RNA sequence: GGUGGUGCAUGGUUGUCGUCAGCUCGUGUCGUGAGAUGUUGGGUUAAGUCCCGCAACGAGCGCAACCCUUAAGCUUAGUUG
RNA sequence: GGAAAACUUGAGUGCAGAAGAGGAAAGUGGAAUUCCAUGUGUAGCGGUGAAAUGCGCAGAGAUAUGGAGGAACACCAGUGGCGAAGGCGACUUUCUGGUCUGUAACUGACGCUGAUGUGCGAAAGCGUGGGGAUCAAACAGGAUUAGAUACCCUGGUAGUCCACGCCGUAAACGAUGAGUGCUAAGUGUUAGGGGGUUUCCGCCCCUUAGUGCUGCAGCUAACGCAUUAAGCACUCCGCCUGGGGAGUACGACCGCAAGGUUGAAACUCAAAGGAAUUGACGGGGACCCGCACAAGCGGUGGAGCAUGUGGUUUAAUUCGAAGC
């Protein structure tokens, strides 16, 4: 959603390669590929996250 | 003992003839047996026929025509499985003076002569203009990993 | 008399791993014991070859030249060289 | 033990508030796979570790103001909180449970275990209506691979999702039954009360209930536990005493079934087992060394010999070797 001109493409793309970077989305489609159990899921949510 | 990695590199004189370091490692190259009186002597007949064909002495077409063999990208095969691995090598120039003539006595032998009074003389000035026998060391590599870009 | 048999009765005895550089002991200490520390962390190297820092110190075997010799020297006798 | 009283810690009935994914009901909207249609166009689109099946000439997908469906609703998301446990997650609201703190007003122990009994009871399975949008047993297709339809892939059936009936089972494990006294600490964090400065809402600190992380004495066989004990004491229930055979025959109970619960012996073996130790190999990771590989230069195998092996052969073509 990140409009980047009044430059050259290269921050253009090292600004929609951040806006992808600093984003829930490119994320969450990372997220949603597959199933994870929720016996499993809070393994993620602890190993990446209750010793963080 | 490769596997340390880098061995340093060896050494070159040059002949009191041309005082070129290159002139006597063009001679370190013809020496097939290493036959030191028996080839050089009999290349300094090769090249007669080497500046027949141009008028410009050897000290100036010697570093005229590896200027066509020395490249600016070759192909080092990288371990990347099942990959083309033409991986586009700017040489460093120990190597790109090595592999410009490396290529030279490995070709003479293939031409309507067989004898190396003039298959030398009949190599060298066929491979100055980046034109056949010698420029398959720059040349190809010039077609080898530039229309499949994609195997970096 | 055996080469007639039997390496596997065996003395040996060699080649191999193998340039592989590794391999052992006494006193401490710690463990209910089975057992662990001296050879290691930092930086420097051709191989238990270093120094700092290390619960360690002492004792080692192989360990480099030591033996033969390259070459670079001096000294001796000039000898048939 | 009975007989006559009280106190309130313990418990209940009070009061001031915090939080939420706690169960059953009504709304708001997003995004997506599937479809049908526009525009659009025509060679591929999908799927592949490797390609292919497939889907493509109907326009397949595509593409947006905009058309729909199935089903849930990343963000606030946490060694967060609530629930006895199975568990609980976009929310707005309904009805509530229950947690907790603080003041502690009051009844004068009104408690704990908990056989019976009653519930929940995860997933799958027995079936109904929305279900086949996606996922997906069973089935299918393509090849790989030395081997297929296996690791790869989709299509796709019930089953899925939910509501409508359950069955009564899990590593339902914190592998620790439940209630009460006492013994080193530090360390965050969830809610309420306590403040000192203040802060422009933040620093330091008391306490409660907890959520966590390290860590004495004691403990065990050691692991490890140590205020969210496996330490030091008290009360109750339940269970256990070699392994198979064995959760097994039978019988009893339940179930709609699936089947489940309940629950032995004959006979055989004297070993099973819990911890912690040294090697072993590793298709587990890591670190150095080698004309091991690469960088370059020839040879043998290319073809005539002769050299002795291995085959033949003899009464001899002696006898022993035999991957580095």
Redesign the pocket.
Request: no cysteine; hydrophobic share 25%.
């Given at each position: 959603t990140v409009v980047r001109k009044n430059e050259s493409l290269e921050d253009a793309l090292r600004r929609f390669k951040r806006s992808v970077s600093k984003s829930?989305t490119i994320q969450?489609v990372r997220?949603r590929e597959f199933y994870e159990k929720?016996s499993v899921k809070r393994k993620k949510?602890?190993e990446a996250?209750?010793?963080r | 003992?490769?596997?340390?990695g880098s061995v340093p590199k060896r050494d070159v004189l040059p002949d009191p003839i041309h005082n070129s370091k290159l002139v006597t490692k063009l001679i370190n190259?013809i020496m097939?047996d290493g036959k030191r009186g028996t080839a050089q002597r009999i290349l300094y007949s090769a090249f007669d026929l080497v500046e027949q064909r141009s008028g410009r002495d050897a000290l100036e077409v010697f570093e005229e025509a590896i200027n066509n063999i020395m490249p600016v990208l070759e192909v080092k095969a990288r371990r990347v499985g099942?990959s083309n691995y033409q991986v586009p090598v700017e040489v460093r120039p120990e190597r790109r003076t090595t592999?410009g003539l490396?290529w030279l006595?490995?070709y003479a032998r293939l031409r309507g002569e067989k004898t190396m009074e003039d298959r030398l003389a009949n190599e060298i000035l066929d491979a100055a203009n980046n034109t056949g026998g010698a420029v398959k060391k720059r040349e190809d590599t010039h077609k080898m990993a530039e229309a499949n870009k994609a195997f970096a």
């Open positions: 829930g969450e997220k929720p949510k602890s996250a209750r010793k | 003992m490769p596997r340390k190259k097939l099942g592999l490396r006595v490995n």
